[PDB]
Symmetry: D2
Subunit: 392 residues, 4 copies
């Protein structure tokens, strides 16, 4: 299979650029030059690149340096045809953010965190980015008495409302995507799941400008069903971006290649995003890989892993397509009544009174007889896996 | 410490009445008589009792029978001075509900599920219940291709909108509390965390009427911080009811006595609910125990475990109070800047233009210096634990 | 593909016979007649059937009744040609076993548990069973102070030594396989992982007669790597039997069809078992399916699910074979140095004195140069998955 | 309370010396001087200090320097009276160990790893250490096809056999303690639980020289019951050392102060270690704290956290003794038949023949009457907790 710009595969500069310094060891790889990253990615089929302010411009660079770096980066995008669909800000690495950015108990840190983001919004706008991703990695706590969650949510809200105000006033037209994570690096992070992030966004001043950027491994760290979570995000129309990667359940954040973790869920996910209503994808944004080339690899291993992500997505798509197109699957879908859930429970114009008067819905209903019919779910499931396995 | 009606301890009929028939063994206790249960609960200090329709009136009882049971039940209530703060409907036991009640693939079951709940609403209304708890235990799936999540949410919403319609027309004054659970009995259940349920509720026709009924153990099954999720629920003003119990992380639902699983989180939870805003509780509803007396116990064990629930709460409350009243704690709270989070990040009348003009929030900000000061959070945590252990 | 008797696929009478009564609901299926189960299994390609004493003969059957059942049973076996490779005893259903069988705190229960087992060994020996599986589902605790573990291990060992004795004296020639499980139905089960069971077995009077019966989902309930634990069981030579099924990480025991849980781990498990050293399988006992047809299915779904287990195993076996015969996979293996681990670290005849003498092992070792070479693990993992996907 | 040298509280240099560089951010604390560490710890009550070669002497220090550091370190011990009970080797930080030390696919790395340990054994022997802790943090894999587990166990064994040989020949008198961990930093680590580690040790050439060093957080990362695992380790007589800390279930390794994670299990653990048979502790080695002062803390928080470890153990000890001494507890233990588990199942001289002859153990046994009696476990648990809360 071959990747096209229409596939919209994007990679964070911090992904292929991860030097592999983990919590227990030193880096095993040298630093990647942003310009080189741009050329390599272009080469493997990516349509865009993303970055944290500090990934491109070293924290504390003078404007002369800063400016120089932006200029070169800009050239590279130019020559290669790559776009910058999203930008984000690093509010977790520097020691000042040890208790968070937007929700640090220290007031001065909160003012500083907003400034850092405003600045990144400026660069984003200049490069044509449409989405600002906010990953509140340090917002949370290790101890319950150390953080007033209520106050914290008020402060998270206060900061986001200002950001939307500014973007709207400067006419940047950005969309904001809150990225949920349950833990790591804080004992517990605020807005731990896709659900909590969506509920929170609904309380902002201009909620229509806000959505979520769910990550495969983040939901899997709590042993949740990522596909089902995305389905809910789509129902709400809050899926503004997505970070794809792999994880093996509740343990540290692994960031494996997409599909190298829960393979069955990777399959149902591609199916959900691609076999949307009327042939068309249910999702239109970037298919962004927020992963890390394993610590045991060298740059060869790095480019390999970059391509594996694209490969995995395209192989899965291909099988998801075939699954749905199979008349035997179509038949099994019918038997399991999957589409019958789309029919309203109530007849047209029917209310409580008409339902209360319908004896077939209760008084004359044979629950025992209906309770005995099988749904044929194992069989439908087995058909899906045989398609995944290329055995059908 | 002794329980008062003011404490508002309530228990489900199904908790003390659980016969301890589990997934791998027969019942070890005989059935508990409801009148008996009312009488025993009144005696241990409970102010109220709750029940699923099928816990009181056996599935399929003729009207004569059903009518007789209610009459006896009401009399017991009468005599003991116990109220019915909440009622719920069993939409999970009978085989007809094997693929869900409101979201079953089968349209006829969905219709029947609504009828079963309307009927329970009438009875709750009759007994003076204020809350209708909805636990969608069979809503979800074992395989991703078996359930269209989107359509399922539409149907869950279609059903709730109708229930609210009816309650409102009839003047019942009920409040609806959705109860989230990540799994069990289904592989994955729709609306798995407190967050997912709050986000969903914000999408119904009369949202003001809807909230959640989170359960200690259900959030812990995903390894989430229960106190922290309750904090967010209170922030959204959607904590309509609470189910208290104990659990040991992600494994089957244990339903232990409150405080017998994660004790530290049980402590921070009581602190949150009781050491509210004024001096007053932050939550005013029933303190409901949704637990199960261990299968190894007889009826002496059952009554002991009921009392243990009340005892754990009162003991934790007492230590939470003492913690907050301690001068050394006040000092640790001041050093950790807990209260500083409550001060707006921005000065009154400050917007992005003023923030951008503040050189001190960025250009002249000494992040290195700020990042070197400690928050003293361990010390604060240590004082909290010492209060819990009665060591101070 | 089609299963042959050489494949050695076996099923427990309790798998296809599960009536689907779970922790939250009634059975959805009627009971399966054992003779009918024998015929249906033979028909789908199973070579054997296994059972708990109470699956075949209802608890408390008089001797005439029990004898009658056993005889009809044997006739079915005879006519179909199916064998009984393993038998087991139910020490978890009856209320008497609420605190365990061999380790109940109650002495009389421990004496009864041993007699229930001895009686099953006789029947096993008469049906030709070669393995007795021991699953101590009720040995454990919900509270730490309720059970003396040391005393419990002593009692466990005391019971197992007697069983080996009787078997050896009767010339039964049975091998014993302890089945580990972390929790469910007890909060914590004794001998929680394959590791704990192996270490325990090593302390018996006649260790050579004892091994383990690990189950896919049981190790996954603790989020452990099943293939890797099986690899270690094989290194100790204690894999006496195996239970294959599917699970989705830490949650109640799902008992899905094999391969329907962690697909990638199922794949590597089949590779380990069949692509053993010397062309041949690394394991030669039964490939036993200890699973449950989902509660949503009827008898058609039950047989579909039985056949899905065998199809899953054969498909994965085919892909594991092709994987290994791929010259590109071989080249990747060589590049990743997998086989180089099989070469002793020390030279023949080298001891610490000679090692200490080798400056190339330390003094002149360039750690930094070695440290920079990639292992090519990602690329290898990618080829593995492409084989599973039928993309190669 | 106050710590005495008889409490044997020890700490690793890497604990209070952790600079707080995590997977997502820079160090928030400067480096701690080892002599100072010796002094500081002596002051808070520790009786000993431990370290990794590389904690003390910077990786790649010339002989002169190394010698220099050791001599200063020896003086500080001298001056303060602290001992070095255990020493360990760093086989996880340097890039050369990315695929492991002892089981690296690369043979040259395995040879180098052995040399690096021999050298630490010498320094350990010279400082009077009695235990060599072996933590194979990089032993494992991210991908199943990348590591031959059987070969890795052979190589692990091969390296340990040699270390034992050396120690015995040099007359060092060291005992070896293998430390199990399920994951982090490798996706899956070899010897993931205390169980797997004990089983392994039993296969070595001089097993009497090997035991384990289980860590509270490591077992909790897999959601296992720490106390129960230590109870099994003591049964086997393999508890050579112990690492105490706190953790909040399956997530990244938190390394909190002991008792700051699962409080109830920290209580039962202290009870098991101290309320041993013959009044005396069941365990007499060092109570070693392998924890990390939270990243939000400065050097004051660091010493605060060090003291917290000691305070937690002593407060728990105090409650564990009060618990056992309480007459009501004594009455609950009796009703729970906790001690009846210590009486053999069989009468002295009884074997299967006499057991079979006992109609009362089977034919005339009333399983139903026995099954109806409760064990009073909930009451017993409640008393334990009230003792922990200082409520009794
Ligand atoms: O787990 C870390 C996050 O996934 C991070 O990469 C964000 O997506 C960007 O700040
Ligand atoms: O986990 C089971 C649920 O908690 C149930 O008891 C609801 O609260 C009422 O249906
Ligand atoms: O989880 C229950 C066990 O897996 C059981 O089926 C045993 O294998 C036999 O008693
Ligand atoms: O989790 C890492 C280990 O706990 C480490 O600190 C060892 O005990 C010493 O190598
Ligand atoms: Mg991530
Ligand atoms: Mg991300
Ligand atoms: Mg529950
Ligand atoms: Mg509940
Ligand atoms: Mg099982
Ligand atoms: Mg099994
Ligand atoms: Mg650790
Ligand atoms: Mg350790």
């Amino acid at each position: 299979v071959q990747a096209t710009r229409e596939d919209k595969f994007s990679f964070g500069l911090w992904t292929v650029g991860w030097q592999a310094r983990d919590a227990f060891g030193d880096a095993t790889r040298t630093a990647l030059d942003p310009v080189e990253a741009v050329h390599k990615l272009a080469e493997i089929g990516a349509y865009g690149i993303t970055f944290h302010d500090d990934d491109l411009v070293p924290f504390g660079s003078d404007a002369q340096t800063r400016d120089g770096i932006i200029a070169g980066f800009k050239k590279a995008l130019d020559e290669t045809g790559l776009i910058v669909p999203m930008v984000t800000t690093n509010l977790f690495t520097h020691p000042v953010f040890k208790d968070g950015g937007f929700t640090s108990n220290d007031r001065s840190v909160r003012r500083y965190a907003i400034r850092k983001v405003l600045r990144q919004m400026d660069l984003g706008a200049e490069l044509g980015a449409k989405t600002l991703v906010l990953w509140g990695g340090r917002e949370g706590a290790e101890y319950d008495s150390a953080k007033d969650v209520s106050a914290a949510l008020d402060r998270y809200r206060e900061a986001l409302n200002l950001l939307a105000q500014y973007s709207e006033d400067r006419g940047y037209g950005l969309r904001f995507a809150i990225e949920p994570k349950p833990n790591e690096p804080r004992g517990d992070i605020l807005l731990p799941t896709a659900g909590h992030a969506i509920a929170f966004v609904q309380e902002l001043e201009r909620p229509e400008l806000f959505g979520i950027n769910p990550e495969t491994g983040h939901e899997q760290m709590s042993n949740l069903n990522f596909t089902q979570g995305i389905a809910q995000a789509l129902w709400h129309k809050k899926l503004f971006h997505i970070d794809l990667n792999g994880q093996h359940g509740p343990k540290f954040d692994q960031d494996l290649v997409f599909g190298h973790g829960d393979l069955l869920n990777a399959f149902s996910l591609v199916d959900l995003l691609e076999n949307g209503p009327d042939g068309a994808p249910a999702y239109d944004g970037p298919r962004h890989f927020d992963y890390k080339p394993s610590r045991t690899e060298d740059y060869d291993g790095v480019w390999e892993s970059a391509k594996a992500n694209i490969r995995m997505y395209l192989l899965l798509k291909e099988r998801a397509k075939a699954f749905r197109a199979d008349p035997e699957v179509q038949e099994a879908l019918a038997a399991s009544k999957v589409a019958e859930l789309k029919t309203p429970t109530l007849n047209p114009g029917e209310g409580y009174a008409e339902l209360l008067a319908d004896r077939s819905a209760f008084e004359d209903y044979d629950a025992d007889a209906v309770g005995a019919k099988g749904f044929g779910f194992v069989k439908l499931n087995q058909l899906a896996i045989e398609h995944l396995l290329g055995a059908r």
